[PDB]
């Protein structure tokens, strides 16, 4: 038996891109997720979050499958240009009145909803004004953080600012895989500074509007290891933890610096000054969320950009290709306590990408996900009964969706959806998962 503490928090999450639908509906504006989508070449199969799973029309049906389960959070985000259809000024009110509702019956079911304010869909007119590349956005996010504080905080009372800003500056603005969809360093760079800049804005506007809240940040996190026991190659790991995992973003938040290998590989890459900015970028937070997935096994390689590659292993692995290593989760949550011991941390995503089937009983038979989920709940156990102060933890998620540049070739959920016919399916995932809820734990 592996119990978890008195009102530990057990969540599902999803992102209003990955599964909402309808993104030009009631006045919204154009994300640049949604040009992204379709411009041809960028998402497998040319898919777009045009209809994704319907939740735009299907939420209560969605909020229903959280209730009946007995999850007790849910994570969503908010998309801004349904709320400030040009990024900034006028207010598009019923994409309020959309995220209302869903609220509403949040609460009187009662489940505590988790809001992500920034999960990637950022409105097209702003990015015609440079997107995270422009410090005026830092001000177009605080404007947008307080519309969400001021709509919402009555009720809503745990909000994450950003979600990854690490793949939405890197992924989006370097490799040039996500929207939206550049290749070039020095505003990778900037775009990761300011991002930092937003957030600490919008921290000190929550705490200028909501009573009794608390507001966190979200990192995604890998396990690297290193290739040999060389120094290089363990150098090459102290690298990939600091640039890849939350150091990057926490050595300013609690330190007033990047981290030292990240400055060595890319000082050149930010701007001048941009050390002024790290006194308001100290914005005291309340937690950190860590999102966790996979491993990967790094050597030092001087032909590599930034000094460093992979190295294949032969673990199993899920759909994604993401080599499974649980004890990942136990050691990104030990080290966030020793390095910068925050006063709370939640797990805000894991789970796994499966090809799932559905059977001739009607059922998706899923033990590859409950595997892959029992041993990371597992070793997050672990990590409380050695003092990681570890509130809650997320399920990535609710429902299969539309998996960025993968589309929706790639299913996460624990709710299967038949996307001919938008039928969800409870996959036997969510009927373990339940049963984790039930006994606050492992059994
Ligand atoms: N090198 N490197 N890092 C690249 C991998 C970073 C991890 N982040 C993501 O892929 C996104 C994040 C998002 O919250 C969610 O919306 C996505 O559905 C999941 C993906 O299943 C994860
Ligand atoms: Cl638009
Ligand atoms: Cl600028």
């Known amino acids: 038996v592996k119990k978890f503490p008195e009102g530990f928090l057990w969540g599902v999450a999803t992102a209003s891109y990955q599964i909402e639908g309808s993104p030009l509906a009631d006045g919204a504006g154009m994300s640049i997720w949604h040009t992204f989508s379709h411009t041809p070449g960028n998402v497998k199969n040319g898919d777009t979050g045009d209809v994704a799973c319907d939740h735009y029309n299907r939420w209560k049906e969605d909020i229903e499958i959280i209730e009946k389960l007995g999850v007790k959070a849910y994570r969503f985000s908010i998309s801004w240009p349904r709320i400030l ?7 598009n009110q019923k994409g309020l009145d959309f995220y209302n509702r869903i609220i509403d019956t949040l609460l009187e079911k009662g489940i505590t909803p988790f809001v992500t ?15 995270w590349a422009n410090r005026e956005i830092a001000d177009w996010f605080a404007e947008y953080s307080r519309v969400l504080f001021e709509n919402f905080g009555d009720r809503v009372k745990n909000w994450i600012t950003l979600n990854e800003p690490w793949v939405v500056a890197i992924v989006g603005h370097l490799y040039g895989v ?36 608390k507001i966190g940040i979200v990192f995604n996190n890998g396990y690297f290891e290193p290739a040999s026991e060389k120094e290089e190659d363990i150098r090459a790991v102290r690298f990939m933890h600091q640039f890849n995992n939350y150091p990057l973003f926490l050595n300013p938040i609690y330190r ?16 001048e000054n941009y050390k002024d900015d790290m006194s308001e970028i100290q914005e005291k937070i309340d937690f950190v969320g860590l999102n966790y997935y996979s491993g990967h096994l790094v050597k030092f390689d001087p032909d590599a950009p930034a000094k460093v590659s992979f190295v294949e292993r032969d673990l199993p692995k899920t759909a994604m ?13 030990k080290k966030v306590k020793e390095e910068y011991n925050p006063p709370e941390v939640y797990i805000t995503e894991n789970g796994a990408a499966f090809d799932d089937v559905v059977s001739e009983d009607g059922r998706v038979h899923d033990q590859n996900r409950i595997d892959y989920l ?13 003092g990681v102060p570890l509130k809650g933890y997320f399920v990535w998620s609710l429902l299969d969706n539309f998996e960025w540049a993968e589309g929706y070739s790639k299913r996460f959920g624990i709710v299967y959806v038949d996307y001919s016919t938008q039928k969800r399916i409870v996959k036997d995932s969510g009927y373990w998962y339940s049963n984790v809820v039930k006994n606050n734990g492992l059994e």
């Open 85 to 91: 259809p040009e990024g900034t000024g006028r207010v």
């Open 117 to 131: 304010i920034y999960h990637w869909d950022l409105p097209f007119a702003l990015q015609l004004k440079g997107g």
């Open 178 to 213: 996500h929207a939206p969809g550049m290749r070039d360093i020095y505003v990778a760079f900037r775009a990761v500074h300011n991002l930092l800049r937003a957030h600490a804005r919008a921290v000190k506007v929550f705490r200028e509007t909501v009573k009794d809240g």
């Open 256 to 271: 007033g610096d990047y981290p030292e290998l990240v400055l060595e590989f890319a000082r050149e890459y930010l701007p």
């Open 321 to 333: 290709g993401w080599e499974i290593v649980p004890e990942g989760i136990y050691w990104i949550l």
């Open 374 to 386: 029992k041993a990371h709940i597992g070793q997050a156990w672990k990590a409380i009964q050695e």
